[PDB]
Amino acid sequence: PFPWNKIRLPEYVIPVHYDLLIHANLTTLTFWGTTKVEITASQPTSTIILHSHHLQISRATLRKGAGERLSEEPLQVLEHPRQEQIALLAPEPLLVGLPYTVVIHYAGNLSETFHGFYKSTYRTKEGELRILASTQFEPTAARMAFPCFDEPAFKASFSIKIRREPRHLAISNMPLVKSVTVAEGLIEDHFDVTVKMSTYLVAFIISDFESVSKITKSGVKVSVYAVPDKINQADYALDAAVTLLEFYEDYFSIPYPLPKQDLAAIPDFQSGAMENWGLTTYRESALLFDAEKSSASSKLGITMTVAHELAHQWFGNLVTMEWWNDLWLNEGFAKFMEFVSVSVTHPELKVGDYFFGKCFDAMEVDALNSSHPVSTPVENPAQIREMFDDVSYDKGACILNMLREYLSADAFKSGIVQYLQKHSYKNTKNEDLWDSMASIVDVKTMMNTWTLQKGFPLITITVRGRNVHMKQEHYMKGSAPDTGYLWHVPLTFITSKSDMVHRFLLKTKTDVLILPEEVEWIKFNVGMNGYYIVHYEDDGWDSLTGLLKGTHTAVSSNDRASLINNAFQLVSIGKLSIEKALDLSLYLKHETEIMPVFQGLNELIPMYKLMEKRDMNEVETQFKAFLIRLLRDLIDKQTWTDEGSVSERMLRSQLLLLACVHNYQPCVQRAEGYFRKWKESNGNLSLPVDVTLAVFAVGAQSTEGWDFLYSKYQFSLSSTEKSQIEFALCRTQNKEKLQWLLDESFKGDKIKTQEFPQILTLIGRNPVGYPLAWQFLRKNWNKLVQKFELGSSSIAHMVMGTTNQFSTRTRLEEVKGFFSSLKENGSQLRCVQQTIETIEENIGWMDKNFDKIRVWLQSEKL
Amino acid sequence: XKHHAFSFK
Ligand SMILES: *[C@@H]1O[C@H](CO)[C@@H](O[C@@H]2O[C@H](CO)[C@@H](O[C@@H]3O[C@H](CO)[C@@H](O)[C@H](O[C@H]4O[C@H](CO)[C@@H](O)[C@H](O)[C@@H]4O)[C@@H]3O)[C@H](O)[C@H]2NC(C)=O)[C@H](O)[C@H]1NC(C)=O
Ligand SMILES: *[C@@H]1O[C@H](CO)[C@@H](O[C@@H]2O[C@H](CO)[C@@H](O)[C@H](O)[C@H]2NC(C)=O)[C@H](O[C@@H]2O[C@@H](C)[C@@H](O)[C@@H](O)[C@@H]2O)[C@H]1NC(C)=O
Ligand SMILES: *[C@@H]1O[C@H](CO)[C@@H](O[C@@H]2O[C@H](CO)[C@@H](O)[C@H](O)[C@H]2NC(C)=O)[C@H](O)[C@H]1NC(C)=O
Ligand SMILES: *[C@@H]1O[C@H](CO)[C@@H](O)[C@H](O)[C@H]1NC(C)=O
Ligand code: NA
Ligand code: NA
Ligand code: NA
Ligand code: NA
Ligand SMILES: [Zn+2]
Numbered sequence: 029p030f031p032w033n034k035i036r037l038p039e040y041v042i043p044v045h046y047d048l049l050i051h052a053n054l055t056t057l058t059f060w061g062t063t064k065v066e067i068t069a070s071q072p073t074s075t076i077i078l079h080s081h082h083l084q085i086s087r088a089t090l091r092k093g094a095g096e097r098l099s100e101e102p103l104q105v106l107e108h109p110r111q112e113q114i115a116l117l118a119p120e121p122l123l124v125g126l127p128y129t130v131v132i133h134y135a136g137n138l139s140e141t142f143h144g145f146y147k148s149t150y151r152t153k154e155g156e157l158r159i160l161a162s163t164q165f166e167p168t169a170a171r172m173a174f175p176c177f178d179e180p181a182f183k184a185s186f187s188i189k190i191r192r193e194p195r196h197l198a199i200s201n202m203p204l205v206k207s208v209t210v211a212e213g214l215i216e217d218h219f220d221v222t223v224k225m226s227t228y229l230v231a232f233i234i235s236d237f238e239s240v241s242k243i244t245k246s247g248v249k250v251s252v253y254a255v256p257d258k259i260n261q262a263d264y265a266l267d268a269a270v271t272l273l274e275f276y277e278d279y280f281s282i283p284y285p286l287p288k289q290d291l292a293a294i295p296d297f298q299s300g301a302m303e304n305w306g307l308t309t310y311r312e313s314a315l316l317f318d319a320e321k322s323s324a325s326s327k328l329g330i331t332m333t334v335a336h337e338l339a340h341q342w343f344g345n346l347v348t349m350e351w352w353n354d355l356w357l358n359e360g361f362a363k364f365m366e367f368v369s370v371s372v373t374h375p376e377l378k379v380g381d382y383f384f385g386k387c388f389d390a391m392e393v394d395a396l397n398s399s400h401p402v403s404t405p406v407e408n409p410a411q412i413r414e415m416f417d418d419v420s421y422d423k424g425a426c427i428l429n430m431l432r433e434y435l436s437a438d439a440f441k442s443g444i445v446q447y448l449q450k451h452s453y454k455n456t457k458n459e460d461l462w463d464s465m466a467s468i469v470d471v472k473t474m475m476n477t478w479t480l481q482k483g484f485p486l487i488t489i490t491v492r493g494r495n496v497h498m499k500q501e502h503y504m505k506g507s508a509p510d511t512g513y514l515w516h517v518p519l520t521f522i523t524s525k526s527d528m529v530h531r532f533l534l535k536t537k538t539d540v541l542i543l544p545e546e547v548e549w550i551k552f553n554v555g556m557n558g559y560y561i562v563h564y565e566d567d568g569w570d571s572l573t574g575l576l577k578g579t580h581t582a583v584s585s586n587d588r589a590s591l592i593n594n595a596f597q598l599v600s601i602g603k604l605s606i607e608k609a610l611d612l613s614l615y616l617k618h619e620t621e622i623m624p625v626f627q628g629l630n631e632l633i634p635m636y637k638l639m640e641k642r643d644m645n646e647v648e649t650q651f652k653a654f655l656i657r658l659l660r661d662l663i664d665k666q667t668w669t670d671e672g673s674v675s676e677r678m679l680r681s682q683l684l685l686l687a688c689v690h691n692y693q694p695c696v697q698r699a700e701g702y703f704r705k706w707k708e709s710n711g712n713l714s715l716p717v718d719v720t721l722a723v724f725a726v727g728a729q730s731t732e733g734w735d736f737l738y739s740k741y742q743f744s745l746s747s748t749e750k751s752q753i754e755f756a757l758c759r760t761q762n763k764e765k766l767q768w769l770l771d772e773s774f775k776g777d778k779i780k781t782q783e784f785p786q787i788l789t790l791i792g793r794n795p796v797g798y799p800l801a802w803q804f805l806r807k808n809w810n811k812l813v814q815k816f817e818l819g820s821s822s823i824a825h826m827v828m829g830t831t832n833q834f835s836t837r838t839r840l841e842e843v844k845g846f847f848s849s850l851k852e853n854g855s856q857l858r859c860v861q862q863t864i865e866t867i868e869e870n871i872g873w874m875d876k877n878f879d880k881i882r883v884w885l886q887s888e889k890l
Numbered sequence: 891x892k893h894h895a896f897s898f899k
Pocket of ligand 4 (some may be wrong): 397
């Protein structure tokens with residue numbers, strides 16, 4: 029009879045301090061623990077509820093302190109596995125306010141997943157298997173490594189002890205202060221006590237990692253750890269980490285409080301990285317940089333990833349959301365701070381130019397009924413994991429950028445600094461942030477509209493002479509009335525007569541402003557800094573289209589990208605015809621800049637991905653031919669080198685890949701020649717990294733080229749090269765080779781299971797592989813859920829990646845029928861609702877627009 | 891973390 033029937037823990041027993049002893053065995057793959065937790069109770073209780081999941085509790089005792097008067101008593105242990113709780117029943121009720129210590133002895137098995145205290149493996153360059161043990165606790169997995177009050181507002185200090193063999197190294201959040209030999213071949217490592225922090229930030233790793241280190245100007249020792257064969261790839265991240273940690277310290281004037289910061293590259297890792305305080309962890313591909321083989325986008329990504337994890341030391345670690353319903357206070361800030369910090373530390377990366385793309389990523393999910401408000405209730409672990417999504421990260425960062433532009437950077441920064449100082453070593457809610465911002469204008473009412481309602485507004489612009497009428501309505505996909513949503517929208521605009529950014533706060537359904545003089549055109553949402561889209565009535569879109577085709581330089585590159593995106597979003601709600609949007613996209617014939625070119629691809633590629641899964645080869649082929657002809661001049665100018673800026677290199681790589689994939693013969697023939705030479709070199713030839721995706725993708729189209737690529741994958745130490753080979757192998761039209769890739773990465777021996785979600789999605793996007801990938805997901809669902817967990821973005825990626833390009837009623841019924849059959853093991857996943865809604869929109873969109881597109885292509889206006 | 895696909899360049 030379990031004496032607690034709620035997922036959330038009681039509020040009236042609070043921990044202060046944990047002493048954790050962990051004894052792991054990497055041979056038998058087991059671990060033993062002794063957890064001591066100092067607690068106080070605010071209410072007389074005889075029962076202590078806490079979290080424990082897959083731990084075998086052998087004994088629990090309660091201690092009542094005092095030098096000579098110290099007494100100890102046994103606790104009866106009950107378990108409620110589905111609530112992931114245990115109950116410790118004491119003989120006598122606890123006395124309110126006095127300190128007790130709970131002592132729990134337990135055992136467990138190292139996890140075979142990517143969470144908890146889990147096993148990771150790698151092979152020596154000689155083929156020898158090595159095993160390490162590492163942790164991943166966020167959000168709710170600390171309870172798989174030690175019993176605890178495993179909710180983020182039960183903060184406490186942690187003294188961690190690790191018993192290990194002499195031959196292995198242990199590292200944890202804090203510096204190692206003492207090592208003591210405790211038996212033959214067993215050493216006990218003592219790490220210093222942590223600051224007050226949440227359970228999900230506890231970390232420890234037992235490994236044979238090597239390290240490199242460098243000291244910040246503030247005296248913090250920063251180290252990168254990696255397997256011996258890869259530690260010579262750690263230099264870039266080490267330098268970036270020192271520069272970025274110094275930036276944050278100087279920026280906020282709030283020092284990093286720990287003596288050291290480690291960055292550990294783990295051979296198996298589910299997410300990109302994790303911000304454990306003092307011991308941040310990473311996929312190898314998110315941290316390790318090979319100067320000969322890594323891509324420009326991987327160098328950018330490492331820099332932004334380190335910036336993200338270091339931002340968390342303030343936004344997440346020092347200040348933590350009170351509950352996962354406000355996870356965006358961690359993840360939206362960390363995402364935003366990537367851009368604040370790297371725009372200063374690495375100005376050559378020009379990252380601010382890319383930021384608005386994150387907003388358009390958010391709008392993809394946020395246009396669907398199945399989105400959710402930025403702040404929204406969650407309770408169970410699957411729902412909590414679902415909060416780690418593009419709404420929390422990208423919408424979160426986007427509405428922060430919008431607010432910063434509205435308040436100004438200096439006022440915004442003053443608010444953030446006060447927020448961090450006031451709530452240091454404590455927890456915050458949505459409302460605490462607005463209070464801090466306002467203490468420096470009704471920020472709270474405004475920002476409640478952006479955090480407590482899902483979605484975003486369509487702003488409609490109607491001009492009569494100097495009179496500029498504005499209307500807001502809720503953007504709802506499928507096509508005009510909605511649930512009366514209303515926002516406080518900080519509008520911006522420029523005109524043909526003024527490129528000063530003008531500002532107007534729209535707080536009502538309708539309003540108007542008066543221009544000083546009549547203008548030839550007006551353009552709202554300058555730089556795409558606002559989380560809204562714009563429609564222009566009357567001649568507006570015709571006129572902005574002529575602007576793009578005549579002097580597309582009248583507005584900025586990101587303003588051009590914003591017009592491309594908005595035009596195609598308006599097609600899906602019936603405010604603009606597909607033909608008018610495609611007419612606008614023809615201006616891309618003369619576009620040179622990466623953001624508008626990439627935005628054009630982001631709107632047009634999905635159209636032929638839908639066609640690929642239908643009996644539509646003729647229109648599909650014509651559409652792809654249109655796309656190549658549209659960009660042919662830019663493609664033809666690309667050099668087959670690694671020259672130029674990061675932006676020039678990323679643009680080059682994607683254009684050459686696109687051209688080769690669509691059989692543009694000039695590019696195919698060059699890629700074939702490079703691939704033949706690479707093979708004849710036995711893989712010893714150094715290809716330009718920027719052409720390697722295209723070269724490998726073409727080479728993999730034959731059996732001998734595919735087999736040769738796979739043969740080289742075995743021995744590569746380069747995360748970029750391994751990603752490029754994986755991408756190429758998934759492009760084959762040989763269905764038995766596609767099945768092999770699914771089987772082998774599912775197995776995890778020749779290709780690590782951490783790559784499986786990506787491989788499944790790439791085959792799902794393959795014009796001949798998509799039936800195989802969808803079949804594989806259905807057949808292997810239970811094991812995939814066991815490995816990756818319900819609610820994980822891994823599972824969401826697999827679900828969307830195998831289904832969200834379907835566009836027929838029969839495919840829709842397959843999707844609805846399968847996921848409905850899962851009951852409590854998947855039927856209620858939010859990603860399932862999102863993919864179903866996406867298929868429903870795809871059906872309507874194709875039914876309405878396919879013949880329109882066919883006729884438009886026949887008009888050969890290009 | 892979420893955004894880890896940039897190696898695939
Ligand atoms: C993880 O589990 C493995 C396997 O269970 C375990 O490996 C075992 O370690 C012990 C101790 O390190 C090994 O036994 C020792 O072997 C050496 C070499 O022969 C002997 O010198 C030792 O004898 C001394 O100590 C003994 C104490 O028991 C005395 O009885 C003796 O008189 C000596 O004073 C001792 O026998 C054992 O061989 C391995 N077993 C295997 C299969 O490798 C490992 O230690 C565990 N690690 C952790 C951290 O728990
Ligand atoms: C082509 O084959 C060469 C012979 O194996 C490679 O050089 C070898 O690279 C190893 C790994 O970097 C290194 O341990 C060996 O010492 C070295 N051997 C010799 C004789 O140089 C070569 O690798 C490139 O060249 C070396 C010198 C280093 O600069 C590496 O970082 C380079 O990748 C192979 N080239 C390629 C592109 O694979
Ligand atoms: C770790 O895995 C082992 C499997 O080897 C589990 O041990 C079994 O547990 C069941 C249920 O208690 C027993 O009936 C078996 O006899 C055990 N097997 C052996 C070989 O002892 C163990 O329970 C797992 N640990 C945890 C915490 O789940
Ligand atoms: C959106 O979802 C809610 C809840 O499922 C539902 O009540 C509403 O009708 C949905 N809207 C549409 C257009 O289906
Ligand atoms: Na701009
Ligand atoms: Na704006
Ligand atoms: Na997600
Ligand atoms: Na994953
Ligand atoms: Zn994060």
